[PDB]
Amino acid sequence: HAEKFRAKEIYKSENLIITQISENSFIHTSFKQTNDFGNVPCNGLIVKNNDETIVFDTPTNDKDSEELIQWITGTLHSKINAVIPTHFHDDSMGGLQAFHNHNIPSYSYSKTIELGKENNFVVPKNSFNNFITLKVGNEEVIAKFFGEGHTRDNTVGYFPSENILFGGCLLKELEASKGYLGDANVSAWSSTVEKVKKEYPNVKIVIPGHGEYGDKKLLDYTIKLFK
Ligand SMILES: [Zn+2]
Ligand SMILES: [Zn+2]
């Protein structure tokens, strides 16, 4: 990592890690319990302007979501304008009920709601097809569907003021394996990520759904992996 903004790990408990990666954005990392490999890390993104934030992805469960919400409200001293699960799997949406219990507006791609309901998961209350821009303070965030890949509903988040891309599980960390393909369209995945890369050429940081963030190289790696 050689970004002009030197990343800072500003919070660490047994269950949640916050890593500041730009002046006003932060990776949230929590864990998914798998009966096979123990706890595996899962990422989301917090963006902030003044005393307002937007969160991409929930932790897998309400307890960790509550820890995250209380950290934002209690330590970042900010309101949460919105939460945006980037796909229907638990590592993006499993802890959504906690956000609803705080009356935090939730948004996802329409297909995320459809696939969530098919699995009797709690789903967001608002939907879009195929992008939305939401205000955070005097800035905005983009949430957009570019095509199928890891799942058929996966969306990405972009914070243009700091050129931060939250790729979600559509994006892989460098050298990652292909991961869980049970819900994937591997035929479209590379083309989808090519579209993301074309749309955000000035990207500075790319955050994958699991593992280590980096720069545009994660886009190139993920494209190549699925060709
Ligand atoms: Zn997934
Ligand atoms: Zn994932």
Numbering used by the authors: 7 to 233
Question: What did the authors write?
Answer:
Here, we report the biochemical and structural characterization of two membrane-bound MBLs: CJO-1 and CIM-2, from Chryseobacterium joostei and Chryseobacterium indologenes, respectively. Both MBLs confer β-lactam resistance on producer bacterial strains and hydrolyze several antibiotics, although with impaired efficiency compared to NDM-1. The structures confirmed that both proteins adopt the characteristic αβ/βα sandwich fold of B1 subclass MBL enzymes (0.59 Å root mean square deviation [RMSD], over 220 Cα of CJO-1 with CIM-2), with two Zn(II) ions in their active sites (respectively). Specifically, a hindered access to the active site with the contribution of a Tyr residue in loop L10 and the presence of a positively charged Lys residue in loop L3 limit hydrolysis of cephalosporins with charged C3 substituents.
Aiming to understand the substrate profile of these enzymes, we crystallized both CJO-1 and CIM-2 in their soluble forms and solved their X-ray structures using single wavelength anomalous dispersion (SAD) from data collected at the Zn edge. CIM-2 diffraction data extended to 1.56 Å resolution, and CJO-1 to 1.34 Å. CJO-1 could be modeled with a partially oxidized Cys221, as has been observed previously in crystal structures of the B1 MBL VIM-2 (33), with 13% occupancy for a sulfenic acid. In the simulations of CJO-1, both loops remain closer to the active site, resulting in hindered access for β-lactams with bulky substituents, like piperacillin, which showed the lowest catalytic efficiency among the tested β-lactams. Among these substitutions, the presence of a lysine at position 59 (with a positively charged side chain) also modifies the surface charge distribution of CJO-1 when compared to NDM-1. This surface charge distribution is likely to generate repulsive interactions with substrates with a positive charge density in their substituents, as in the bicyclic β-lactams tested with positive charges in their C2/C3 substituents, e.g., cefepime, ceftazidime, or imipenem. Overall, the combined effects of Leu59Lys and Asn233Tyr substitutions in CJO-1 introduce a steric-electrostatic effect on the surface of the protein surrounding the active site. We generated the Lys59Leu variant of CJO-1, and we determined the resistance phenotype of E. coli cells expressing this variant. This replacement increased the MIC of cefepime, the poorest substrate of CJO-1, by almost one order of magnitude, with reduced impact on the MIC values of cefotaxime and ceftazidime. Despite other features that can fine-tune the reactivity, we conclude that the main determinant of the distinct substrate profile of CJO-1 against cefepime is based on the electrostatic repulsion with the positive charge of the lys59 residue.
